[PDB]
């Protein structure tokens, strides 16, 4: 009788059961062991290398594993592959579509990912023998704006498009090996775990669903946020991850806890977050807010360790090097401030 | 090495800088345009009436040596709270609204809330909107046929009359111009409600005449960069 309402109430009681199971293992929080370790203080990082080569607003960026070559996306149709050590542009990829929203550096440095409102993930070859940069694979199977994507290897990547579905692509042939379905809202950002076996993607439903690359199914669902999760980054330990949504709060979820542990909230900041990254140790949560300033949130002390000056427009892209050497912050002013 | 790969990387950076300076000329020369509507609001006719131009994703037209980048969004999803933020450096937001769709659904109020969200946005607040009241050829007979009235989905029509500063079309019922301009002022009521001075609505009655609609975009985009530069020098 009333299979629609029956399944709705079954989902409701399952949600209550999951919430009760979360609260059962939530006898304490991350803010209750704050009297056991020393704080970090207000450390103000400075712009070490300034990257001014973009024409339109910089919407996406990604660091390389060498922590030297960083790529960045902008609405001008250019994918500038910077060199953070010498402040040089290694490549300027002419993009097919002007508006692009995603950027992903290959773990080997040979490939790069792009895409946006075109619903097409344009993979470009970096170390190719053809001289300039050309397209390597045209991953066109999404029906929404490709918000963010990450590079597992030079063979398969995962993209979070605006069609409420993520998908593990394949650079070899160009088809979705497995589609990550389950997001009720358009997915805005995904993050790869250091183990690269599973990933979590933050969508516009305040639910950063944890997926598994191997089985292609949704592992967990983290419904602790309140607005569109535009940023996400997996804790360097691999069992946790932070999220940046439009509700002006960041939350550090844990895969082994299936709930939020830390709430990076501050009444002085009311703008949303679209840039989240962790340091080498995960203590500093680089969170790029929409007030033109990035707050270096302490993942264990519930406070920012000093906001980031410089950028005068919304920072929609931010990443920390694989060794935590520096963090390149790119905002909507066509600039990339690399902090250290 | 010391100056083998360092100087070579610097030369590559210089070549990339030259290419980027060459592309910045055309980037600032062309004006990106956001073409969107409330769903089957006649935007297909605007894509047709724009340089007669990978389907409906982006069209480029050039008038008086001024190229434009009219980006259509007829292939995205319904939720438009994130991809519309990518149009923050866009020059104009051409809102193609079916002016005769106030009942068929109440697409005007759907477009009003779309216009109000575009107008009062956090990123689209510094960008004007070229209001294209499309489907006007159907509005020329929609109010007289009785199949679609204004009062059933807009009670402010009884308290509204044709403005004195209006330019009615020769050969139209004053009830049509009263209804056509009510839709214009309905979008303008929420447009001028911002009061920021950084962006102003450009209401045009589209699909009524088959003239060059990009010429209307050209004259609007000309005043867009005018008032943007006027606001830059505190002259407006």
């Amino acid at each position: 009788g009333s299979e629609l309402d029956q399944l709705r109430q079954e989902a409701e009681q399952l949600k209550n059961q999951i919430r009760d199971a979360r609260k059962a293992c939530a006898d304490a929080t991350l803010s209750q062991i704050t009297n056991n370790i020393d704080p970090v203080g207000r450390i103000q990082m400075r712009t070490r290398r300034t990257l001014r080569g973009h024409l339109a607003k910089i919407y996406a960026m990604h660091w390389g594993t060498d922590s030297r070559l960083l790529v960045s996306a902008s609405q001008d149709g250019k994918l500038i592959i910077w060199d953070s050590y010498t402040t040089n542009k290694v490549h300027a990829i002419p993009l097919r579509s002007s508006w692009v929203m995603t950027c992903a550096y290959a773990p080997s440095g040979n490939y790069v990912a792009c895409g946006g409102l075109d619903n097409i993930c344009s993979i470009y070859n970096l170390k190719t023998r053809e001289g300039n940069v050309r397209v390597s694979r045209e991953l066109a199977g999404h029906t929404g704006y490709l918000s963010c994507c990450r590079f597992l290897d030079d063979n398969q990547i995962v993209t979070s498009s605006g069609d409420t579905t993520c998908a593990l692509w394949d650079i070899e042939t160009g088809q979705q090996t497995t589609t990550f379905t389950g997001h009720t809202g358009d997915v805005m950002s995904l993050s790869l775990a250091p183990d690269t076996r599973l990933f979590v993607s933050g969508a516009c439903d305040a639910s950063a669903k944890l997926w598994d690359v191997r089985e292609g199914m949704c592992r967990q669902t983290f419904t602790g946020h309140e607005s569109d999760i535009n940023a996400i980054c997996f804790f360097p330990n691999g069992n946790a991850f932070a999220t940046g949504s439009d509700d002006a709060t960041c939350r550090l979820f844990d895969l082994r806890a299936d709930q939020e542990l830390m709430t990076y909230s501050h009444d002085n900041i009311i703008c949303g977050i679209t840039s989240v990254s962790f340091s080498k140790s995960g203590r500093l949560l680089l969170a790029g807010y929409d007030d033109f300033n990035c707050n270096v949130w302490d993942a264990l002390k519930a406070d920012r360790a000093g906001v980031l000056a410089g950028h005068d427009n919304r920072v929609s892209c931010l990443g920390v090097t694989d060794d935590g050497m520096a963090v390149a912050t790119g905002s909507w002013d066509s600039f990339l401030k690399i902090w250290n | 090495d010391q100056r083998n790969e360092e100087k070579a990387q610097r030369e590559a950076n210089k070549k990339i800088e030259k290419q980027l300076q060459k592309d910045k000329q055309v980037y600032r020369a062309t004006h990106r345009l956001l073409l969107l509507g409330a769903g089957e609001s006649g935007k297909s006719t605007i894509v047709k009436q724009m340089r007669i131009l990978t389907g409906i994703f982006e069209t480029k037209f050039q008038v008086d040596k001024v190229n434009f980048h009219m980006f259509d969004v007829g292939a995205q999803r319904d939720e438009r709270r994130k991809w519309i933020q990518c149009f923050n450096d866009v020059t104009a937001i051409i809102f193609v609204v079916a002016s005769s769709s106030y009942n068929m659904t109440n697409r005007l109020q759907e477009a009003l809330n779309l216009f109000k969200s575009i107008w009062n946005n956090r990123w689209l607040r510094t960008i004007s909107v070229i209001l294209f009241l499309n489907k006007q050829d159907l509005l020329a007979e929609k109010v007289l046929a009785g199949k679609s009235k204004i009062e059933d989905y807009f009670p402010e029509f009884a308290r509204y009359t044709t403005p004195e500063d209006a330019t009615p079309e020769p050969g139209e019922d004053p009830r049509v111009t009263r209804a056509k301009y009510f839709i214009r002022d309905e979008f303008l009521r929420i447009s001028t409600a911002s009061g920021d001075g950084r962006h102003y609505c450009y209401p045009h009655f589209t699909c009524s005449v088959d003239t060059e609609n990009i010429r209307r975009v050209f004259n609007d985009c000309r005043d867009i960069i005018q008032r943007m530069h006027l606001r830059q020098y505190e002259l407006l």
């Epitope: 409420t164 009720t184 809202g185 969508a203 516009c204 439903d205 305040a206 419904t223 309140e226 607005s227 569109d228 439009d246 509700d247 002006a248 009311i270 703008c271 949303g272 | 319904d78 939720e79 438009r80 709270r81 519309i84 759907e110 809330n113 779309l114 109000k116 969200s117 575009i118 107008w119 009062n120 946005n121 956090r122 689209l124």
Partner: nanobody, 128 residues
Framework: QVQLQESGGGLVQPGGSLRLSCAAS????????MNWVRQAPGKGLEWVSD????????SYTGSVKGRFTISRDNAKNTLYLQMNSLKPEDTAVYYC?????????????????????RGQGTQVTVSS
């Protein structure tokens, strides 16, 4: 978690009164521009009313302008839509769609189905 349950509704006579109680839990209800949308059988999701974060910017659609009445309760975290002088065309499942970005006067919750911060939907229908 964002979750919106609207109590009330049902089958009433055209021209009477009706009031929906939208339970807004899981977010700062006093910081989001909460609004009301409906979806008539055979029609898409149409915006009905809207109210600011504190209760100043109150707006309604033309079909309900003067008839309905929205009122937010920031103390109880509840959004109300006092429906008065009902019409035969008010037969729709009213949703409690919420604006996603807080502290903003803009949002796109009038879009099609599968909206995140939207109520579950109460079938508010009338006779004739």
């Amino acid at each position: 978690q964002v979750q919106l349950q609207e109590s009330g509704g049902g089958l009433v006579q055209p021209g009477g009164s009706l009031r929906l109680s939208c339970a807004a839990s899981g977010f700062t209800f006093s910081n989001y521009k909460m609004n009301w949308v409906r979806q008539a059988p055979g029609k898409g999701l149409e915006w009905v009313s809207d109210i600011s974060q504190s209760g100043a910017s109150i707006s309604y659609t033309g079909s309900v302008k003067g008839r309905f009445t929205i009122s937010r309760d920031n103390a109880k975290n509840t959004l109300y839509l006092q429906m008065n002088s009902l019409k035969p065309e008010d037969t729709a499942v009213y949703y409690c769609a919420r604006c996603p970005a807080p502290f903003t006067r803009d949002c796109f919750d009038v879009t099609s189905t599968t909206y995140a911060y939207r109520g579950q939907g109460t079938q508010v229908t009338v006779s004739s």
